[PDB]
Amino acid sequence: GVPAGDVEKGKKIFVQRCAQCHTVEAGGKHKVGPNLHGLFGRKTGQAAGFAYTDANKAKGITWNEDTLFEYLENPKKYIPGTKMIFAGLKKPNERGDLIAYLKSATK
Ligand code: HEC
Protein backbone atom coordinates (compact mmCIF):
# COMPACT_ATOMS: atom_id res chain seq x y z
CA GLY A 1 0.00 0.00 0.00
CA VAL A 2 1.02 3.65 0.53
CA PRO A 3 3.28 4.31 3.56
CA ALA A 4 2.50 7.12 5.95
CA GLY A 5 3.85 10.55 5.08
CA ASP A 6 4.86 13.81 6.75
CA VAL A 7 2.11 16.39 6.33
CA GLU A 8 4.41 19.40 6.69
CA LYS A 9 6.64 18.10 3.89
CA GLY A 10 3.49 17.30 1.93
CA LYS A 11 2.11 20.82 2.42
CA LYS A 12 5.34 22.27 0.98
CA ILE A 13 5.00 20.02 -2.08
CA PHE A 14 1.36 21.09 -2.47
CA VAL A 15 2.17 24.79 -2.28
CA GLN A 16 5.05 24.45 -4.78
CA ARG A 17 3.45 22.01 -7.25
CA CYS A 18 -0.36 22.12 -6.92
CA ALA A 19 -1.66 25.33 -5.31
CA GLN A 20 -1.26 27.31 -8.54
CA CYS A 21 -4.24 25.33 -9.86
CA HIS A 22 -6.05 23.93 -6.78
CA THR A 23 -7.57 24.96 -3.47
CA VAL A 24 -8.36 22.45 -0.69
CA GLU A 25 -10.78 24.10 1.76
CA ALA A 26 -14.54 23.64 1.80
CA GLY A 27 -15.96 26.41 -0.36
CA GLY A 28 -12.57 27.20 -1.87
CA LYS A 29 -12.67 28.44 -5.42
CA HIS A 30 -12.18 26.47 -8.59
CA LYS A 31 -9.14 27.76 -10.48
CA VAL A 32 -7.56 26.13 -13.54
CA GLY A 33 -8.19 22.94 -11.58
CA PRO A 34 -11.09 21.96 -9.30
CA ASN A 35 -11.32 22.64 -5.60
CA LEU A 36 -10.24 19.41 -3.89
CA HIS A 37 -12.30 19.52 -0.72
CA GLY A 38 -13.95 16.14 -0.04
CA LEU A 39 -11.72 14.31 -2.52
CA PHE A 40 -11.12 11.06 -0.63
CA GLY A 41 -13.90 8.50 -1.06
CA ARG A 42 -15.46 10.32 -3.99
CA LYS A 43 -15.42 9.32 -7.65
CA THR A 44 -13.50 11.24 -10.30
CA GLY A 45 -15.11 14.26 -11.87
CA GLN A 46 -17.52 15.18 -9.08
CA ALA A 47 -16.55 18.59 -7.66
CA ALA A 48 -19.67 20.66 -8.12
CA GLY A 49 -19.41 23.47 -10.64
CA PHE A 50 -16.11 22.49 -12.31
CA ALA A 51 -15.95 21.77 -16.07
CA TYR A 52 -14.09 18.44 -16.28
CA THR A 53 -12.93 16.64 -19.38
CA ASP A 54 -14.89 13.61 -20.48
CA ALA A 55 -11.69 11.63 -19.81
CA ASN A 56 -11.67 12.56 -16.14
CA LYS A 57 -15.40 11.88 -15.68
CA ALA A 58 -15.08 8.55 -17.51
CA LYS A 59 -12.26 7.19 -15.33
CA GLY A 60 -14.78 6.33 -12.61
CA ILE A 61 -12.37 5.30 -9.84
CA THR A 62 -12.73 6.38 -6.21
CA TRP A 63 -9.94 8.69 -5.07
CA ASN A 64 -7.91 7.30 -2.15
CA GLU A 65 -4.26 6.83 -1.21
CA ASP A 66 -3.60 4.06 -3.75
CA THR A 67 -5.29 5.69 -6.73
CA LEU A 68 -3.65 9.06 -5.98
CA PHE A 69 -0.26 7.34 -5.62
CA GLU A 70 -0.58 5.96 -9.18
CA TYR A 71 -2.16 9.10 -10.67
CA LEU A 72 0.36 11.56 -9.30
CA GLU A 73 3.32 9.58 -10.66
CA ASN A 74 2.10 10.25 -14.21
CA PRO A 75 -1.35 11.87 -14.56
CA LYS A 76 -1.74 11.41 -18.30
CA LYS A 77 -0.92 7.72 -18.07
CA TYR A 78 -3.62 7.15 -15.46
CA ILE A 79 -6.22 9.35 -17.19
CA PRO A 80 -5.27 9.65 -20.88
CA GLY A 81 -6.71 12.87 -22.29
CA THR A 82 -6.90 14.71 -18.95
CA LYS A 83 -6.39 18.49 -19.12
CA MET A 84 -4.32 18.51 -15.91
CA ILE A 85 -0.91 19.56 -17.24
CA PHE A 86 1.43 18.14 -14.60
CA ALA A 87 4.50 16.07 -15.41
CA GLY A 88 4.32 13.87 -12.32
CA LEU A 89 5.86 13.46 -8.89
CA LYS A 90 8.36 10.73 -9.56
CA LYS A 91 9.72 10.03 -6.06
CA PRO A 92 7.51 7.74 -3.91
CA ASN A 93 8.47 9.49 -0.68
CA GLU A 94 7.30 12.83 -2.11
CA ARG A 95 4.05 11.31 -3.35
CA GLY A 96 3.52 9.75 0.06
CA ASP A 97 4.09 13.02 1.91
CA LEU A 98 1.79 14.88 -0.49
CA ILE A 99 -0.93 12.25 -0.09
CA ALA A 100 -0.71 12.48 3.71
CA TYR A 101 -1.21 16.23 3.39
CA LEU A 102 -4.16 15.83 0.99
CA LYS A 103 -5.87 13.22 3.20
CA SER A 104 -5.90 15.66 6.11
CA ALA A 105 -6.25 18.97 4.26
CA THR A 106 -9.33 17.96 2.23
CA LYS A 107 -11.29 16.32 5.10
C1 HEC B 1 -2.69 23.43 -13.27
C2 HEC B 1 -1.53 23.66 -14.26
C3 HEC B 1 -2.60 22.07 -12.53
C4 HEC B 1 -1.59 21.69 -11.64
C5 HEC B 1 -0.19 22.25 -11.54
C6 HEC B 1 -2.06 20.51 -10.98
N7 HEC B 1 -3.36 20.27 -11.35
FE8 HEC B 1 -4.59 18.83 -10.66
N9 HEC B 1 -6.02 19.25 -12.11
C10 HEC B 1 -5.96 20.32 -12.96
C11 HEC B 1 -7.04 20.26 -13.87
C12 HEC B 1 -7.28 21.19 -15.03
C13 HEC B 1 -7.83 19.20 -13.48
C14 HEC B 1 -9.06 18.63 -14.23
C15 HEC B 1 -8.59 17.63 -15.28
C16 HEC B 1 -9.64 17.14 -16.23
O17 HEC B 1 -9.27 16.33 -17.11
O18 HEC B 1 -10.80 17.61 -16.19
C19 HEC B 1 -7.17 18.56 -12.39
C20 HEC B 1 -7.59 17.44 -11.68
C21 HEC B 1 -6.96 16.90 -10.56
C22 HEC B 1 -7.43 15.78 -9.82
C23 HEC B 1 -8.76 15.06 -10.08
C24 HEC B 1 -9.90 15.74 -9.34
C25 HEC B 1 -11.25 15.05 -9.46
O26 HEC B 1 -11.40 14.06 -10.20
O27 HEC B 1 -12.22 15.65 -8.91
C28 HEC B 1 -6.60 15.64 -8.71
C29 HEC B 1 -6.69 14.59 -7.63
C30 HEC B 1 -5.57 16.61 -8.89
N31 HEC B 1 -5.80 17.36 -10.01
C32 HEC B 1 -4.52 16.75 -7.98
C33 HEC B 1 -3.42 17.57 -8.18
C34 HEC B 1 -2.33 17.66 -7.27
C35 HEC B 1 -2.25 16.97 -5.94
C36 HEC B 1 -1.38 18.49 -7.86
C37 HEC B 1 0.04 18.78 -7.36
C38 HEC B 1 0.92 17.51 -7.37
C39 HEC B 1 -1.93 18.94 -9.09
N40 HEC B 1 -3.18 18.41 -9.23
C41 HEC B 1 -1.38 19.88 -9.96
C42 HEC B 1 -4.90 21.23 -13.05
C43 HEC B 1 -3.70 21.19 -12.32
Ligand 1 pocket residues where CB is under 6 Å: 17-18, 20-22, 32-34, 39, 44-47, 52-53, 55-56, 63, 72, 82-86, 89
Domain that holds residue 39: 7-105
- The dihedral sign for the CA sequence 8, 37, 43, 51: negative
How far apart CA 106 and CA 104 sit, in angstroms, is 6
Report the nearest-CA residue for atom 41 of ligand 1. Answer: 18
Please check whether residue 1 lies inside any domain of the structure.
no
Please check whether residue 96 lies inside any domain of the structure.
yes
Method: X-ray
Do 101 and 18 contact (CB within 8 A), yes or no?
A: no
Q: Using the CB atoms, write b or e for 31-40: b if 16+ within 10 Å.
A: eebbbbbebb
Report the nearest-CA residue for atom 35 of ligand 1. Answer: 18
Do 60 and 52 contact (CB within 8 A), yes or no?
A: no
For the chain, what is the domain count?
1
What angle, rounded to 10 degrees, do the helices at 7-17 and 92-105 form? 90
Please check whether residue 2 lies inside any domain of the structure.
no
Q: Is 18 annotated in some ligand binding site?
A: yes
Resolution in A: 1.2
Q: Is 62 annotated in some ligand binding site?
A: no
Please check whether residue 31 lies inside any domain of the structure.
yes
**Nearest-atom index, ligand 1, CA of 14:** 37
